[PDB]
Coordinates of C-alpha atoms (C1' of nucleotides) in Angstrom, one line a residue:
Chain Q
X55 CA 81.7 101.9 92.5
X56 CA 81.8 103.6 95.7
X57 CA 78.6 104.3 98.5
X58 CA 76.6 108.0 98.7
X59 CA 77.9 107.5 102.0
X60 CA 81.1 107.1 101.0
X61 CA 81.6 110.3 99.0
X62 CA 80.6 112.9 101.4
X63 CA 83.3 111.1 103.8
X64 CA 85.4 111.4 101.4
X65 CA 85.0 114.8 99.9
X66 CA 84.8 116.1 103.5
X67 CA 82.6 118.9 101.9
X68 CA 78.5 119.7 102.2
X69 CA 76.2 117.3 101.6
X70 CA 74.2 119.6 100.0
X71 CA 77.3 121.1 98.7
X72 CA 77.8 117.5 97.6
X73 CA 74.2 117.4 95.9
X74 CA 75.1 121.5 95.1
X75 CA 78.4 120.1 93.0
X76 CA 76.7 117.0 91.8
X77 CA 74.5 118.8 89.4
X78 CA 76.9 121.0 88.1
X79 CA 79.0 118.4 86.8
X80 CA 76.7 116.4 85.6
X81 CA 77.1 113.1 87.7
X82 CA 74.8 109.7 88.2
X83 CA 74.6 107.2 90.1
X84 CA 74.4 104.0 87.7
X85 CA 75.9 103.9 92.2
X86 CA 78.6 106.1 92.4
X87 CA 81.5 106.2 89.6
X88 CA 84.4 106.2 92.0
X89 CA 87.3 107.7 89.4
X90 CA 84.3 110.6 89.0
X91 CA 84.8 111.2 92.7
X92 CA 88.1 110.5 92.6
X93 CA 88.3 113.1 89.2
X94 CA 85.9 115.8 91.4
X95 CA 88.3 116.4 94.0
X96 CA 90.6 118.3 92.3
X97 CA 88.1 120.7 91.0
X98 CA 88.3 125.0 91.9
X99 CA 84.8 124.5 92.9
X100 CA 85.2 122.8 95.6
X101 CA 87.8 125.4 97.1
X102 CA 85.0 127.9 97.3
X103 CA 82.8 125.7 99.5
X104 CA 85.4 125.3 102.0
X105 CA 86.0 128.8 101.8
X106 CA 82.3 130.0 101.9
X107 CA 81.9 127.7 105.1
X108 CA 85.0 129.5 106.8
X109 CA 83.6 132.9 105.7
X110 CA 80.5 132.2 107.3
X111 CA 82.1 130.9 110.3
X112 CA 84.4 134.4 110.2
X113 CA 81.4 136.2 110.2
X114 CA 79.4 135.0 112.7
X115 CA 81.6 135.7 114.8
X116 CA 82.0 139.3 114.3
X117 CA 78.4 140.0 114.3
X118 CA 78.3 137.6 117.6
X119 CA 80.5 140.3 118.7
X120 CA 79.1 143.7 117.4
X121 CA 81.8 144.6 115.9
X122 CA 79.3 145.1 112.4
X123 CA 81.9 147.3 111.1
X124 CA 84.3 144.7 111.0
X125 CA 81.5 142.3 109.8
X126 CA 80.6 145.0 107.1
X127 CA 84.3 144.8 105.7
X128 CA 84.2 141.3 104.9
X129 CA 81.4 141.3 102.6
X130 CA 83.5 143.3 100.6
X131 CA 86.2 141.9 100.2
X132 CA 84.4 138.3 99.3
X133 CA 84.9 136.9 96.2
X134 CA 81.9 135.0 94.2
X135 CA 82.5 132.0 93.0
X136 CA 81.8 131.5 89.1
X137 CA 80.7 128.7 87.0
X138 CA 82.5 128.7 84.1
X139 CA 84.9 126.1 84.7
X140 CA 82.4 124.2 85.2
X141 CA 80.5 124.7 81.9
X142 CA 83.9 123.8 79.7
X143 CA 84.1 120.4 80.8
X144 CA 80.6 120.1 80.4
X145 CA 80.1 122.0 77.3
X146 CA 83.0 120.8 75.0
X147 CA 80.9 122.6 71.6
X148 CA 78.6 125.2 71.3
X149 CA 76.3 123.0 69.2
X150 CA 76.1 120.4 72.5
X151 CA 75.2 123.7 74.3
X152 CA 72.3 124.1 72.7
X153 CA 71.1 120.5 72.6
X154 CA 71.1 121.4 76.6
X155 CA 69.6 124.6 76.3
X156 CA 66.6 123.0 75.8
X157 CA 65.9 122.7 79.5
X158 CA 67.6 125.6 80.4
X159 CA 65.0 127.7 79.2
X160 CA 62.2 125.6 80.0
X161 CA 63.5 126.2 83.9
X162 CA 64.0 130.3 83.0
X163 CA 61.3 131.0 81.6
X164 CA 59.2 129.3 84.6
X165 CA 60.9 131.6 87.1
X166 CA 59.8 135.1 85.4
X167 CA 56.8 133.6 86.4
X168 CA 56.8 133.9 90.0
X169 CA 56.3 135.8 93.3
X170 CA 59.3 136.6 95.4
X171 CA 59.2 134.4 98.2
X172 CA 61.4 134.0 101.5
X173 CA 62.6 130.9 100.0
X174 CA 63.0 132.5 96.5
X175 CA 65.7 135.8 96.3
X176 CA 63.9 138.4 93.7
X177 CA 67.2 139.4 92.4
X178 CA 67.7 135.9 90.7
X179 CA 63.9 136.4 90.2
X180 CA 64.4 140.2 88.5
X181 CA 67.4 138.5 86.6
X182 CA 65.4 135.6 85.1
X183 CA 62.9 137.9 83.7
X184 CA 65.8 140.1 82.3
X185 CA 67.3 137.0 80.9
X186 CA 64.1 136.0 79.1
X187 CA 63.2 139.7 77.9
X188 CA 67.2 139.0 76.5
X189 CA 66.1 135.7 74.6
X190 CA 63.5 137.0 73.2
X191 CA 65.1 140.2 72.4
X192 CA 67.5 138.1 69.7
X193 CA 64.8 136.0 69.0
X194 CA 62.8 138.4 68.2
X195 CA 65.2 140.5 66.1
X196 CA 66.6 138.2 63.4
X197 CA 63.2 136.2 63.5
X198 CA 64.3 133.4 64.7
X199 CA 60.7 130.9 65.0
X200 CA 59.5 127.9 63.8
X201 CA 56.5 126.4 65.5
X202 CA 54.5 127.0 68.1
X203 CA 52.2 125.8 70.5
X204 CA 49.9 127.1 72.7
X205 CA 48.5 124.2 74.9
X206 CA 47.1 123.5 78.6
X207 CA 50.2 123.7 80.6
X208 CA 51.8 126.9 78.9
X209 CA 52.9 127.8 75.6
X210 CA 55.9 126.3 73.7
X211 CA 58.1 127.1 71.1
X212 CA 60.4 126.1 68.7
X213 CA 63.1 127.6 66.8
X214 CA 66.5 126.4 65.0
X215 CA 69.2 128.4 67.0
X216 CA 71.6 126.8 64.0
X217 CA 69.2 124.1 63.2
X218 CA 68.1 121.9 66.9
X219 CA 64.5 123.2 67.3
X220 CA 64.6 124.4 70.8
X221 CA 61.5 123.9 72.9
X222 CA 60.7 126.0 75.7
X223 CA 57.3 126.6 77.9
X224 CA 56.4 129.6 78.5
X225 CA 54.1 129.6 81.6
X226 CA 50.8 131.8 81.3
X227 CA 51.1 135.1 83.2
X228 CA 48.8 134.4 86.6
X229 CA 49.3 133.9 90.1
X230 CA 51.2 130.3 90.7
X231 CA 50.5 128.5 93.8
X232 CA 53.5 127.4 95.5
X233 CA 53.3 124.4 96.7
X234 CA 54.8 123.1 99.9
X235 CA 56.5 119.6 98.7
X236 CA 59.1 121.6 96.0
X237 CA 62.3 122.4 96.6
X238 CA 63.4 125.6 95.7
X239 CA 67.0 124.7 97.1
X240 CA 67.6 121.8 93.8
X241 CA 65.5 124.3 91.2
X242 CA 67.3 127.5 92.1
X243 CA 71.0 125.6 91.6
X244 CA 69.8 124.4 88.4
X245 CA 68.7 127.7 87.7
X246 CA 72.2 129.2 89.2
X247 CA 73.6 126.6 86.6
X248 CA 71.5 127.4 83.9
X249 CA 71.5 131.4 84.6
X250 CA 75.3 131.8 83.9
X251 CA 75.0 129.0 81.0
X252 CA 72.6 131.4 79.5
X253 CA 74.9 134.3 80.0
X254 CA 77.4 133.0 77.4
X255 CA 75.4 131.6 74.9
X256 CA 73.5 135.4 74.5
X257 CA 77.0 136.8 74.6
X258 CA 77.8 134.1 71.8
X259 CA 74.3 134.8 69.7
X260 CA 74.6 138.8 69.5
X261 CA 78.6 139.2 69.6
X262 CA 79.3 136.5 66.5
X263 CA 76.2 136.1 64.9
X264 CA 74.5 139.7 65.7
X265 CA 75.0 142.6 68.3
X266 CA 76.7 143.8 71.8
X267 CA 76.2 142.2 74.7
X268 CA 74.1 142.8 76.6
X269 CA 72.5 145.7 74.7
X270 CA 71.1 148.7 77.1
X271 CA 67.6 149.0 77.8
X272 CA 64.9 151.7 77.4
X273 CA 63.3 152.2 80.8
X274 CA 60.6 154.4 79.8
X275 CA 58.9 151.3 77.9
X276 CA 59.5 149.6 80.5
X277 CA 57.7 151.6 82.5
X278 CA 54.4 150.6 80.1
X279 CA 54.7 146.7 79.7
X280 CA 58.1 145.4 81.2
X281 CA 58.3 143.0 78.3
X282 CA 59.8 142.8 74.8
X283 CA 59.4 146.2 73.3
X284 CA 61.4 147.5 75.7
X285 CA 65.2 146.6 76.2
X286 CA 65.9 148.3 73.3
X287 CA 69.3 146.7 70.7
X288 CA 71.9 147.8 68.7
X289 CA 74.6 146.1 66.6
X290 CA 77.0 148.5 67.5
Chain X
rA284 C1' 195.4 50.4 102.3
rA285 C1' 190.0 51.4 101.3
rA286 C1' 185.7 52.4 104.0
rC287 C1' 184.3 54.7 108.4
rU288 C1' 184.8 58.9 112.2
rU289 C1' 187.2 63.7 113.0
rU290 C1' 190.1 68.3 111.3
rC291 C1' 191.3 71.6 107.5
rA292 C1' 190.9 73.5 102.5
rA293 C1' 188.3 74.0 97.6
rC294 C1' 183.6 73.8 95.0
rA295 C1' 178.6 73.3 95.4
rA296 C1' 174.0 73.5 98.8
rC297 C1' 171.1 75.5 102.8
rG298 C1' 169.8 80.1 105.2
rG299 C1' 168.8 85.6 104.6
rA300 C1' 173.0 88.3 108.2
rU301 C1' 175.8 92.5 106.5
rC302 C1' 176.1 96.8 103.2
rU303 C1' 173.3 100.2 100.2
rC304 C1' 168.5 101.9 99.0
rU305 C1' 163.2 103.6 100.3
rU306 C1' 155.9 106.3 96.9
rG307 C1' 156.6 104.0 104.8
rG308 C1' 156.5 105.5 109.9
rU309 C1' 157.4 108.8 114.2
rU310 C1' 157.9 113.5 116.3
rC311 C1' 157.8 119.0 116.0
rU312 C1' 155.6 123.4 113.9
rC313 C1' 152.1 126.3 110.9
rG314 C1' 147.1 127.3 108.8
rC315 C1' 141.8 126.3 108.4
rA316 C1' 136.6 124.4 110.4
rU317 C1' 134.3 121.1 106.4
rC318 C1' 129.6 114.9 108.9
rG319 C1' 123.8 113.3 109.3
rA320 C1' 116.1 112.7 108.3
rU321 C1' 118.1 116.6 101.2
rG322 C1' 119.4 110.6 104.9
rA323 C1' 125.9 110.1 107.3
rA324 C1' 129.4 106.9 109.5
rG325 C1' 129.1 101.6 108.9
rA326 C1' 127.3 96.6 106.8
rA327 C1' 125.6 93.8 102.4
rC328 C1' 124.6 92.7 97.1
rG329 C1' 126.6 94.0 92.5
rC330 C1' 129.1 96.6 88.4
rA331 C1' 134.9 96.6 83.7
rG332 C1' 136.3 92.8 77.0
rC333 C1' 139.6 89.9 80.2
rG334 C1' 140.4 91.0 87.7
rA335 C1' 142.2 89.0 93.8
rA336 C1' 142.9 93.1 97.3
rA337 C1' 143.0 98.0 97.0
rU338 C1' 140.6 102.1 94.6
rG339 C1' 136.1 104.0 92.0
rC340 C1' 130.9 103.4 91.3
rG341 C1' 125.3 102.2 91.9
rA342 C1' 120.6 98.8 86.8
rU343 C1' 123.0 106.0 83.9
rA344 C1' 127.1 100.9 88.1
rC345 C1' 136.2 101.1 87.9
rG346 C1' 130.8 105.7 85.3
rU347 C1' 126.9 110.1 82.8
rA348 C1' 126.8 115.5 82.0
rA349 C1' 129.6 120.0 82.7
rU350 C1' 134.6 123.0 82.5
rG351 C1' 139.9 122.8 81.3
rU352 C1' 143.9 120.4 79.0
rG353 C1' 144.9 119.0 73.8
rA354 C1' 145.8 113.2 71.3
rA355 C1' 146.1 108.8 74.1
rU356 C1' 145.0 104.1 76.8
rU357 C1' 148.7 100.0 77.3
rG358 C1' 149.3 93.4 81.8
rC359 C1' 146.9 91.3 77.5
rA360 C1' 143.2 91.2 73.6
rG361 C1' 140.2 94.3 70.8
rA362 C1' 138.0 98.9 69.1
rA363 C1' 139.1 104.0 67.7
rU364 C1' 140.3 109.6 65.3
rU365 C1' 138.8 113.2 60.4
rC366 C1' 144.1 114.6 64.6
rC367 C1' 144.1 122.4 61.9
rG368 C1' 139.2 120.2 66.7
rU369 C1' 132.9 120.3 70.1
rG370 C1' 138.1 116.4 71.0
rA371 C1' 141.6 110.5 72.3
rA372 C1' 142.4 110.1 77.7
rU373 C1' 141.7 104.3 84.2
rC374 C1' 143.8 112.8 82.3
rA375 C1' 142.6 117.2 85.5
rU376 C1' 138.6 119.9 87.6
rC377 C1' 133.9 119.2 89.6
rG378 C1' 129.0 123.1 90.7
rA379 C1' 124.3 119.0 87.1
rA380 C1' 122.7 113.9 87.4
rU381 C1' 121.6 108.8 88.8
rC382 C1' 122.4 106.9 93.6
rU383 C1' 120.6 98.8 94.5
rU384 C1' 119.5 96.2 99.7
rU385 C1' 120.2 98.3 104.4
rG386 C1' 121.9 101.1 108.4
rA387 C1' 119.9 107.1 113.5
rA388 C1' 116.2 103.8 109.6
rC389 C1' 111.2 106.1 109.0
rG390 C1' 104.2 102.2 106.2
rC391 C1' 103.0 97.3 109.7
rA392 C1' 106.1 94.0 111.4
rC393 C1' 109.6 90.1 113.2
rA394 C1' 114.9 87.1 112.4
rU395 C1' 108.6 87.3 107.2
rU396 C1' 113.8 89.4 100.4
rG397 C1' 106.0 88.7 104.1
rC398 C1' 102.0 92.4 105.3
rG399 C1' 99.7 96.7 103.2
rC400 C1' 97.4 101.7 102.4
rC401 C1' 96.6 106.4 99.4
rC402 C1' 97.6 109.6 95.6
rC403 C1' 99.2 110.1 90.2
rU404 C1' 98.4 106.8 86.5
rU405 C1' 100.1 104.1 80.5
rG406 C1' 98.2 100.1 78.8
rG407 C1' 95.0 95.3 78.7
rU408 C1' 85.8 97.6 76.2
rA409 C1' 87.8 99.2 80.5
rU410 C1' 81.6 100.2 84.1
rU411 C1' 83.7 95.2 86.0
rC412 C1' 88.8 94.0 87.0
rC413 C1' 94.5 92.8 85.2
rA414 C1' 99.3 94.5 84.6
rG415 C1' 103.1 98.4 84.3
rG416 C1' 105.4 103.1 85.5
rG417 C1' 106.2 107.1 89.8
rG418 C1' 105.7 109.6 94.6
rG419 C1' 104.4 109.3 99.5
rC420 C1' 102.2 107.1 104.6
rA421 C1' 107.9 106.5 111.6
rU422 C1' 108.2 109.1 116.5
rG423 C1' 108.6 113.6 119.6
rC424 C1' 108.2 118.8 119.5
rC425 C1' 107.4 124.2 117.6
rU426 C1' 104.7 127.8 114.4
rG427 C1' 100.3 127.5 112.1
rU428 C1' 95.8 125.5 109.7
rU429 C1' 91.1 122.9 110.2
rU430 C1' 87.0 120.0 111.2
rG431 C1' 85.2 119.4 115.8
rA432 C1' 84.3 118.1 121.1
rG433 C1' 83.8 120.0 126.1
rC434 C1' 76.8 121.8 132.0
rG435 C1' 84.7 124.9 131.2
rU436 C1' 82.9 130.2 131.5
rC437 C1' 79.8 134.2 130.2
rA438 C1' 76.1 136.8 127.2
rU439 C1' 70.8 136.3 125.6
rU440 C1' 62.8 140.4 125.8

RNA sequence: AAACUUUCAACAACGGAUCUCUUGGUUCUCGCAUCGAUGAAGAACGCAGCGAAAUGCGAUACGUAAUGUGAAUUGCAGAAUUCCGUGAAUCAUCGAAUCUUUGAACGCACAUUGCGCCCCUUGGUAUUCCAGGGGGCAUGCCUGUUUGAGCGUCAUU
């Protein structure tokens, strides 16, 4: 085993960066596996950390400058680092997706939930209630259900996506009181984990077992409740 | 007289002169530019069925692959080869290989076959550790690259 304070040495990267990567692999301190390290730092990931520092080194400088035009162009031409070689490793078969999908949902379907904050974006707000109006569209459709259970701290569910009874709160629709000890910086990259998790698995849902992905939506529905009669579905 | 000493002759000995030879040398002329951190020149340890030097070669070790030739190698022993063919040969050619320990010698060292570090790792559950396989870690300097440091300078309603 190696020290925490060994491994950011080592990886020369972010601490947070460090606690950013360590939940996308998946990685516990027992302390710290040192061939898991030693396995992490060959990873794609961790080129895009080095190269989102020196982007945001690049930048600074420009707008330091006033050149914006020059600081416009680089946003541009920036790439976005994805998460799906992260998910393989992780997520050898589909069926030991879903046995994890358990709390992806029940962090997704908190964050429809709630005000856009400074600390919060609203995009990855906007998308999370998109993403649950897109479970419950296939859930919905081929009636998916099993249980339920409406209690005190919000409403769960359960349903066999191929036979593992999901469960998954659903908060109640109110004003949430933020409070001021969370840490919307280890939530949101679970969510950021969990949002392109849940990408693949609704792509795997409609486009072998049922429709297209994602299917359009009907804004003028949405217009009236913003929920589930809306985002209207097709097979093809 | 014999023996002995000396002289000559004959036949043996001793020695290697002379003659003849010559895969060697020397000199002259002509042409060409071709060593080394991809590790040379040099030193050492080894390697063949049986070897001293020489020559060749590096645990793939008097060789391996490739191409040509077309049937030997031969001091001795012993294997071979379908010989109307992917093929004998210490053959020729030579472009692909391996290339021990060193040596400008380059992980740290002094004259220690010691003293280690990192990466990759197949095995002994290997989470502990143990062993094997493989590649690197010298100095100076250039072009970068990068994490920085610097009351070194300036900006800042």
């Amino acid at each position: 085993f190696i020290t925490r304070s060994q491994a950011v040495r080592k990886l020369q990267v972010s601490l947070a960066d460090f606690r950013r990567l360590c939940i996308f692999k998946g990685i516990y301190p027992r302390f710290y596996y040192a061939k898991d390290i030693q396995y992490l730092m060959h990873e794609p990931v961790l080129a895009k950390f080095r190269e989102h520092k020196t982007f945001a080194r690049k930048l600074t400088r420009a707008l330091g400058r006033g050149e914006v035009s020059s600081a416009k162009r680089l946003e541009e031409n920036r790439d976005s680092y994805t998460l799906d070689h992260i998910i393989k490793e992780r997520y050898p078969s589909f069926p030991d997706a879903i046995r994890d999908i358990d709390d992806a949902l029940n962090m997704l379907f908190l964050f429809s939930n709630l005000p856009s904050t400074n600390q919060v974006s609203s995009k990855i707000i906007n998308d999370a209630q998109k993403i649950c109006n897109q479970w419950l569209a296939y859930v919905a459709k081929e009636r998916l259900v099993r249980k339920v259970f409406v209690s005190i701290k919000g409403v769960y569910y359960q349903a066999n996506i191929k036979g593992e009874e999901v469960r998954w709160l659903v908060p109640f629709k109110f004003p949430e009181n933020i409070p001021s000890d969370v840490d919307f910086r280890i939530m949101l990259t679970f969510l950021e984990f969990y949002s392109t998790l849940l990408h693949f698995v609704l792509y795997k849902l409609y486009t072998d077992s049922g429709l297209i992905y994602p299917p359009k939506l009907d804004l003028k529905k949405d217009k009236i409740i913003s929920g589930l009669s809306s985002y209207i579905l097709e097979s093809r």
